[PDB]
Amino acid sequence: EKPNVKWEDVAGLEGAKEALKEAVILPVKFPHLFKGNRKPTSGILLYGPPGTGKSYLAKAVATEANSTFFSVSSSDLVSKWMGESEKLVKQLFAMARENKPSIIFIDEVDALTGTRGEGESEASRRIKTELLVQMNGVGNDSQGVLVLGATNIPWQLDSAIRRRFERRIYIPLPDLAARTTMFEINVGDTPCVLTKEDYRTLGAMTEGYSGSDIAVVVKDALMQPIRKIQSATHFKDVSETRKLTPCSPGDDGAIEMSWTDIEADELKEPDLTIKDFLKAIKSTRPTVNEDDLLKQEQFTRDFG
Amino acid sequence: NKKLRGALSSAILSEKPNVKWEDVAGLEGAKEALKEAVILPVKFPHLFKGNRKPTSGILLYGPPGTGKSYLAKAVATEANSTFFSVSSSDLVSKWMGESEKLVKQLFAMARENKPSIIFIDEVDALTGTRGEGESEASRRIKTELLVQMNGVGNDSQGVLVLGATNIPWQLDSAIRRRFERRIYIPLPDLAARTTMFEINVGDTPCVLTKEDYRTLGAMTEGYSGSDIAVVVKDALMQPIRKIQSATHFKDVSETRKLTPCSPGDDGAIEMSWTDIEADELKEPDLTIKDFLKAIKSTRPTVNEDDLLKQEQFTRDFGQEGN
Amino acid sequence: NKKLRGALSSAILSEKPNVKWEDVAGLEGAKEALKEAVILPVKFPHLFKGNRKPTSGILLYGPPGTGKSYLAKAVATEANSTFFSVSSSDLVSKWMGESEKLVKQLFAMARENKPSIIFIDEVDALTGTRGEGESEASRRIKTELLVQMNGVGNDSQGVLVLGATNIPWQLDSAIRRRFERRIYIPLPDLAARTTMFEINVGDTPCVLTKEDYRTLGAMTEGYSGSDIAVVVKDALMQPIRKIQSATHFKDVSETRKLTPCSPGDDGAIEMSWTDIEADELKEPDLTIKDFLKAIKSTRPTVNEDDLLKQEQFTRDFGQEGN
Amino acid sequence: NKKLRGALSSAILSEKPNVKWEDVAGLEGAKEALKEAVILPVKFPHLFKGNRKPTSGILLYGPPGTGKSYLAKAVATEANSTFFSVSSSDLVSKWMGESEKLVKQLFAMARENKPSIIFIDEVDALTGTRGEGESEASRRIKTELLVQMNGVGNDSQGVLVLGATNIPWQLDSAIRRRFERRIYIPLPDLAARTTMFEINVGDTPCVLTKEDYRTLGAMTEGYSGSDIAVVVKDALMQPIRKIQSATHFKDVSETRKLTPCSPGDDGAIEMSWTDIEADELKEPDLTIKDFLKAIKSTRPTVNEDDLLKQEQFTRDFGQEGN
Amino acid sequence: RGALSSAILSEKPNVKWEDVAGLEGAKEALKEAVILPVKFPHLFKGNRKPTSGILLYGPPGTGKSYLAKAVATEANSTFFSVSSSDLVSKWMGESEKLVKQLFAMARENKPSIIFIDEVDALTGTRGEGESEASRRIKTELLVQMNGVGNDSQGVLVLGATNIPWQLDSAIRRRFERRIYIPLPDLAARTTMFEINVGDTPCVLTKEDYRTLGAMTEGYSGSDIAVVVKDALMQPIRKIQSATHFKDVSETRKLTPCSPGDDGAIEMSWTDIEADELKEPDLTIKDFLKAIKSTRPTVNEDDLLKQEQFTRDFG
Amino acid sequence: AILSEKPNVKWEDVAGLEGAKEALKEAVILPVKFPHLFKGNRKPTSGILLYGPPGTGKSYLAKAVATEANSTFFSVSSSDLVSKWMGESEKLVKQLFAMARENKPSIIFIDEVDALTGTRGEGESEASRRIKTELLVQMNGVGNDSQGVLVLGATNIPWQLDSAIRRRFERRIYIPLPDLAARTTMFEINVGDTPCVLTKEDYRTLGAMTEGYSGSDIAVVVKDALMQPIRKIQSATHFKDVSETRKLTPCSPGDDGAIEMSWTDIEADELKEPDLTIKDFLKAIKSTRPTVNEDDLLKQEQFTRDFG
């Protein structure tokens, strides 16, 4: 399923980008370099803290694959009816065997696969076990499928399934050039007075934010001027025939009115300033804690 | 009847995964027991008469990734008998005691096709010590497996029941009884690791000698066979990364042939793989820094208290797979 | 009606597994009770008149592998009755209260063909104390089994209901009441173990004496009858293995006959078993080192807190199987 | 219509199990209530006019094996009323509300054949407090039983609904309401146990006195009536064990009569029971070591926390059966 | 037709409004929903419409079905006592026409009151139920109980239940007056003893019934009906248990008396002639005997969930 | 299962709520009035949650928005979706969004978004994952078709609303319990034309005397009060003639023409039902407690503070 999403669209971490461009494109663009002992990779576990653009990179592989893409997830495989949560898995791999090449993206694999020391009999042993046997097994033939998977708790994963995912890549909190790129992307084609040093300023300002947070500070900063439109007392003419904008109570030509009072078009909507983005970044707060990072770095140093 | 055979028609595998006994490295005890329980009754059936009966159950256990399912593939190639690779997806159903008729129907199918082998992979997910489990799935699937394996009116002649597991201590004691040769598949030793490198490089052109493979096998203590399969995978994927990572190729030698070389060399043109014509590429060579590169990057899987409980079970109930 | 009898027609077993009362070792008490509840009413029916009625339920329990199902096969050979052999696979159905007209027409089959025996193998999987179980399976199959065994209008004359279990403490107290002689089948003792070696070697040519079997029986304390059946299996598969480790055979003595011998001996030709002609092989007999070899390799099944709960139940509700 | 009466024609029992009110031991109060609810309306129907109506529901509960179903057989002999004995096998049909159409037809038959008795044995398997049960079986069979017992247009004149149970606390409170005399059948006391030994030995020749039965009744505290029926069963087998273990018999005294005696005695011939002619055997009379032998071997069936929940229910909702 | 017209009863169980003890709010609502539209039909014109649904709930045994019998006697209606046995069927598309037929014959027989007793057995939240029985019945019933303006004669839908919290919220909506029938207090209990002894000869006074009504707190009306049943049995215990009777006073009449008394012959009831028995009087020790033996029925946490539902919806 | 209508409810028909109203005007009406304001990456709200105690007619307000946005009102009850329809609920949530797309400008109203969206940790498979998984996919429908549709959710218990669903409702607006003027209007509307002798001041009194009541509450009290004269006529002993030939009404023991009798004694029609009074409602106010707990103010205002 290919809507836009591209390798051009993503910001930072070219190790992930090159591992994947390798593991999907390098067989598909060339299916004749992989003969003999040289086989492509058949499982990749991405992880990291939330917000860091995992599933977006997955759908970049969906568009940028020329491959089928099944974005099932752990919400859709839980059941409660005695061995229904397994036939879903098996028929998923049946449509992936019948349709080579394929990609299976199991989002939040930590909700299926929970270290089996405290879990219940059926769901633990039977969903984990059918995932194991189905990934390599005996009569199963994992040719041409790639099993992705993302997680935030990579240390709560069963060691047999840590074994099956043969390239555990770590997606970290991003740097400076990526943040500047994300502001430049998310403002889109909206008229703004900002320069390169303005986006550079904001990217310097936001250390610690993931890509979600910058998408919502651009959302809020794009909704500042409309907010000063419609909750406005007092506008004022400036300058092609009449044009009024919101201004404080008592100013040079400050009439008292509401946006409703003002004629079609002849509104002078407030511009997009860097104080709008600084306003939004002051108000919007991220998720993370700096001990979660210690256990992530633990797992990366032990297995990743 | 035929609804159930319509379900279990997709278990008689029909493709013979070409793994031979030579490919499976180490473990001569487990191959020995499996040969004298699978190969030898068919090849010399006159011997097994009187009190001398063949074995009818073998449990393989061990840490994750050491050879269990793979050795089952070796049996599936070399056996010449009907092989059912059943699993938990194919035995549980929703309708109140229609799971049991799939178990009973599986062995009642297997005695139509005698000699047969039934390979229940990860038997610890069916058979969970029955002190905390639920009524139906627990007592009725475990109980029908028990009664069906030896029972009264049941006749386990000519069927063999394999089975692999990673948690052999969470197994019910009646089913520990039914599996009459619990063999233990351990982490490989030095000669096995050297054998696995020599196998996994295949017929790929390499400058390595016997002392090189001997060196790597000395280097990798603690790795299972999966890990050595992926360090050979990564070390084989180094040269392609030396074609993509090439600001510069060079002609050598049937009409034009260029390979990656360092910046500034004898005939070093500056280009990318994309610039170079179909076929007329001459890929790199394998030297021990490729394997050292891969072994630095790839990190193991297992953990050294899991081995204590495995050795516990082997010392209390188990064979030794050598 | 007849749909259900068409289902349960395949439970009245008819092949008569040829185990006779000799072939069980130990357990004089359990054979004694089973004879005076099965054999004796048929052979002398004039006795059982007045207040003297035969027994109508016997529960055998014990650790895994000690003789329960085997003793049921002995009854199935020696009884001269219509031995049914039913289980939980054959009573539970899919369509809403079919899983108890099966129970009812099972016992009505045994009443039409009296004197009958009903052998419910592993009864703790049908009958689970009904405080946590589900409505249909639990209350309705357990309840129809209760009412059908003694009830009001039901007449359990001339039917006998056996039953074996490994978890006798998880049994409902009404069904503990219905089984009126709970006999306990324990792990073996010295004379029984010696008897089991003498039985399981069969008619195989061996150099062993009575003091040799006596020696092995002294050696194996802690083993159940399964374990001794598999050490006899392995020890009978030792000389075939020495045929396999025999670079060198030798003629001895009806036209040519060769056996494995050490390198360099009186008539020691160098060959493999493959080289040697059909029949004209001379199989080596059995050393006591073969059995000591097998007993070193094979390891028992039971543990020693399972025995505490077995002895608990025997001291609170049970008999002693001797 | 007639399909359904063809199903329920096999419930009108027609054989009158010959248990009389003296074959019940103990239980003054329960016999008293059952007589004045069953016997007395038929024998003197002129009395029950005006405000004085007969009882229309009686629940018997207790520990397992104490007299409930047996007292129901006594009613079935002495009542002179049609005695329907229905159960959960005969009400749960396959077919969308037959399990309500069957119930309604049941009481319609028991109104066209009044005076009638309906004995629902083990009512706790139909009626399970409806907080966890399934929609159909739960709400629709329980609900049709409720509405059918008293309801609006229903007229429970002249029908009586008995019912026995072992788990009286797992009963729905609307159905606890419908059963308007919950009587409790307890474990027997001293005089009852002595009475049960005197009954169960029957007319068998024994040397026992009143102080012997008194001794045994003093010995057996904790036993229900089932257990004493089986210690009398086992103790009545003890002369056969003598008369088989008898190397040596001897004539005593209508033409020849021989009994087992010790080796070397007055007229001690050496033989086996097999050697001795039809009838002309003399079997040692029941002498008190036979009963002491049986009482040593046979062990109680009911534990002592089940009694705490029985006494709980009796103290919260119940009568006392004395 | 001829399969649901076994919902009409015709025997008229003779319970009148002066036999239910207490419950005056419930009689008030039932009178102004049943009696008053028929007796003064000119009043209900314009915005003033009669009530079209009444749910009675409570603990088990407190008066719900009995009060429905009182309506069935006093209403002068046509009365359908339908239930889940009479609506569900094997054939699909029969548990549509059966409900539909029911309300159409209710409009054949206006005025109609329909008593769907124990509605929680038809209407079970439809998340686990089977296809045929649960869904098409409950949807068709919701539709046909959405006849607000058209049902100005005819259907008044009663309904009783013991588990009012297991009822679907759309059907909690349709029943527009959920009335709660509780365990009875002092004057009601005294009234029930005075009713249930009937015209039986007793030596009791008003302070005796007052005493018993003070004694029985916690009992529902069923329990007092059975202590009066048992206490009325107590004379026949004092006739069966007899060694000695005696003549008193229309030609010969003998009653049980103690061993050795004025005219105390020794005999058994069996010895005595038809009729000429003098049935002993009813004391207060008979009732104290019965109240000692009989033990209450409702448990005091069932009342907590009843009070829960009353405080949330009732 | 899905209602549709082009409703005709003006802002003025909705008692009070002026603050919500003004929020909705700029959240919904401004985009619709001046669409040219929303070119490029500036996009109108497309999820709004309405939250507050029951009995505020969140539904009615929702129809006013539709009327004022000149849009079709499509609506669904989540309780019905979860219980009544179950099996076909996925289909229903689909069709609902599909109708709304086909009918821009339009508004989807989901009532009781709390009875649908319950955090998905312990819910059953079909209703839980399938209904709560379809709504979310559909509300991502702003993008495939961001323009022309708006989802308004309604909840009484916002604290029990699935955080995933919660997050799809950018804008959140608290619908508070009413006010003196509004309660006064509600009394008038609820009696409408009914014959009674209430003054303008009585209505205000009734208003003042029902602080903390909802429209619903007031509706039940009024329904109760109007029946009082019928209640009096139906049950009384002493009656009395007043005034087309004989007409008697209940009066106290001992009054001007007070005969002693029962309603049963009195002839068809000629029975005088009591006139309506302001005082009588006061009775009805005592016998109907308000529905809504007082800690809701804060719980709703916590939401106005946090997600307003």
Ligand SMILES: Nc1ncnc2c1ncn2[C@@H]1O[C@H](COP(=O)(O)OP(=O)(O)O)[C@@H](O)[C@H]1O
């Ligand atoms: N590192 C990033 N680079 C580019 N876009 C990002 C990044 N992180 C988040 N985003 C944007 O935020 C949106 C949500 O990211 P998502 O991948 O769903 O988060 P998560 O990885 O936590 O599941 C995506 O559509 C993505 O485009």
Ligand SMILES: Nc1ncnc2c1ncn2[C@@H]1O[C@H](COP(=O)(O)OP(=O)(O)O)[C@@H](O)[C@H]1O
């Ligand atoms: N002893 C071995 N010899 C050859 N290959 C092995 C060995 N052990 C593991 N492998 C490799 O491991 C994979 C098989 O997985 P397996 O060892 O069966 O896992 P498990 O034993 O936990 O089921 C194959 O890639 C195989 O190449």
Ligand SMILES: Nc1ncnc2c1ncn2[C@@H]1O[C@H](COP(=O)(O)OP(=O)(O)O)[C@@H](O)[C@H]1O
């Ligand atoms: N008492 C015994 N005498 C002889 N063989 C025995 C005895 N008990 C066990 N065995 C051996 O045990 C084997 C397996 O035991 P089995 O019949 O399964 O016992 P059970 O069903 O109780 O577990 C039998 O086939 C027999 O070979």
Ligand SMILES: Nc1ncnc2c1ncn2[C@@H]1O[C@H](COP(=O)(O)OP(=O)(O)O)[C@@H](O)[C@H]1O
């Ligand atoms: N009270 C008793 N008096 C006489 N025999 C009794 C008594 N209780 C039990 N028995 C004997 O024990 C058996 C068990 O009685 P039964 O009716 O089955 O008990 P229940 O149904 O309660 O479990 C009866 O058949 C009878 O043989």
Ligand SMILES: Nc1ncnc2c1ncn2[C@@H]1O[C@H](COP(=O)(O)OP(=O)(O)O)[C@@H](O)[C@H]1O
């Ligand atoms: N108010 C009452 N007046 C008279 N008898 C009553 C009353 N309530 C209960 N009873 C007695 O209890 C019996 C049971 O009433 P019933 O209709 O079964 O109650 P419900 O249906 O609530 O459980 C009544 O028939 C009568 O015997």
Ligand code: BEF
């Ligand atoms: F004792 Be066996 F396992 F039946």
Ligand code: BEF
């Ligand atoms: F009926 Be019994 F008490 F098991």
Ligand code: BEF
């Ligand atoms: F209140 Be009753 F038990 F119907």
Ligand SMILES: [Mg+2]
């Ligand atoms: Mg494997």
Ligand SMILES: [Mg+2]
């Ligand atoms: Mg067995």
Ligand SMILES: [Mg+2]
């Ligand atoms: Mg019984």
Ligand SMILES: [Mg+2]
């Ligand atoms: Mg009732």
